[PDB]
Amino acid sequence: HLNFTQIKTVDELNQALVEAKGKPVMLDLYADWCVACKEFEKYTFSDPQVQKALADTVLLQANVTANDAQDVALLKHLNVLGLPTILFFDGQGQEHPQARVTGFMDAETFSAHLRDR
């Protein structure tokens, strides 16, 4: 349902953040094998409340399924401990670590998180 822009590398993330500057950003770290990622798609990203709450946010996604060298370098640079992980950047491109989501959240919980981020 959500319309994500895929990014693969650190450099691609940086250029996406340059281009997004002035608008907030969400970066979803995805893998086909991560059950929580599939649960986000099923329960959370499918919910209109969440979709509408994100309508004015730039949505980026990295698909780290393969755990290839670029995937690994991206996760390292973001200091990601494992999946699921969703990061947020404000309209200046700054990441606030308290806004990271590192477990499943249902639509109500995720929407409240957004509201608080």
| φ/ψ (deg, to 5) at 78 | -85, 0
What is the rounded CA–CA span in Å between residue 117 and residue 98?
8
User: Which run of H or of E encompasses 60?
Assistant: strand 58-63
Which tokens sit at 62?
A: 């990295």
Residue 4 is classified by DSSP as P
Position 2, amino acid: L
Matching residue, tokens 């990014």? 7
User: Please, which experimental method was used?
Assistant: X-ray
Task: Strand 58-63: give its sheet, edge to edge.
Answer: 5-6, 58-63, 25-30, 85-89
CATH code linked to domain 1-117: 3.40.30.10
- What is the rounded CA–CA span in Å between residue 117 and residue 8? 25
> What is the rounded distance in angstroms from the CA atom of residue 39 to the CA atom of residue 36?
5
- Stated in angstroms to one decimal place, the resolution of this structure is 1.0
Counting every residue written for the chain, the total comes to 117
Question: Which sequence spans correspond to the domains of the chain?
Answer: 1-117
Instruction: Please give the Cα distance from 99 to 117 (Å, whole number).
Output: 6
Enclosing H/E stretch for 88: strand 85-89
**Per-residue exposure over 51-85, b if at least 16 CB sit within 10 Å of its own CB, e if not:** eebbeebbbbbbbbeeeeebbeebbeebebeebbb
